[PDB]
Amino acid sequence: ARPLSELVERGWAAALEPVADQVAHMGQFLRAEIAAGRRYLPAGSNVLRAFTFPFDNVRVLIVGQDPYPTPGHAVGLSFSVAPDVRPWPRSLANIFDEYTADLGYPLPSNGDLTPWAQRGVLLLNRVLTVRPSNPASHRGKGWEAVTECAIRALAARAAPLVAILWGRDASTLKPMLAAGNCVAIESPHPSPLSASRGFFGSRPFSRANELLVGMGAEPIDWRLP
Ligand SMILES: O=c1[nH]cc(F)c(=O)[nH]1
Numbered sequence: 001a002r003p004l005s006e007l008v009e010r011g012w013a014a015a016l017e018p019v020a021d022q023v024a025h026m027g028q029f030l031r032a033e034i035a036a037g038r039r040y041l042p043a044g045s046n047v048l049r050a051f052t053f054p055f056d057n058v059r060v061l062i063v064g065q066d067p068y069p070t071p072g073h074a075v076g077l078s079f080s081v082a083p084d085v086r087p088w089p090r091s092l093a094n095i096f097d098e099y100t101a102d103l104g105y106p107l108p109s110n111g112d113l114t115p116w117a118q119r120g121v122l123l124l125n126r127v128l129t130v131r132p133s134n135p136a137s138h139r140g141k142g143w144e145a146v147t148e149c150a151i152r153a154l155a156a157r158a159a160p161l162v163a164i165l166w167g168r169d170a171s172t173l174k175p176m177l178a179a180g181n182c183v184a185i186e187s188p189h190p191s192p193l194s195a196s197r198g199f200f201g202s203r204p205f206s207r208a209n210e211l212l213v214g215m216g217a218e219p220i221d222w223r224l225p
């Protein structure tokens with residue numbers, strides 16, 4: 001029970017100012033969900049976690065759909081799990097197969113993507129909560145304006161940005177991001193169902209670095225332990 005500035009990093013609090021009202025609304029929605037006896041993921045204190053790393057250092061945004069639907073998996077950073085979670089969700093296993101294929105680094109030891117978030121990657125979902133076992137259950141309930149505002153804010157900075165958009169809902173952001181300082185990469189989602197359609201082979205990590213370097217920005221260090 002805090003205002004924006006307390007929920008997110010200082011730069012993000014400034015960026016998300018237009019949606020402070022909407023964030024408060026979403027808190028009221030989630031309260032109502034609990035009152036009704038429906039659950040949501042991730043934990044309340046993690047819902048805005050992706051915005052707890054500096055808005056200024058963001059260079060890449062990875063965007064997915066909505067949080068993992070299995071309790072114990074979603075932690076407020078898209079695609080990430082806690083470092084003691086295994087087996088990994090299949091989407092993450094597929095992401096890590098593409099990581100090794102693209103970059104040649106060893107398979108990660110765990111599924112925690114916190115290093116990426118600490119290095120300038122925004123790990124966003126288009127929708128920031130979900131009911132358990134019910135993927136896409138909070139689509140259309142008010143998060144989209146919040147995540148739109150985030151993206152537009154990033155795209156408005158006088159800095160290079162690369163977006164990696166995984167799946168259909170993320171793909172909706174592409175036109176928003178398209179001024180000349182912003183470059184979006186789009187592919188099918190890494191989940192098993194969709195990955196065969198073009199996630200594998202997409203080389204998003206090396207491509208995003210080629211793009212950053214070509215715009216004069218530092219590349220991302222993608223290495224995971
Ligand atoms: O954070 C997420 N986990 C799983 C997904 F499939 C997705 O889109 N985002």
Ligand SMILES: [Cl-]
Pocket residue numbers: 037038039040131132
């Ligand atoms: Cl529920």
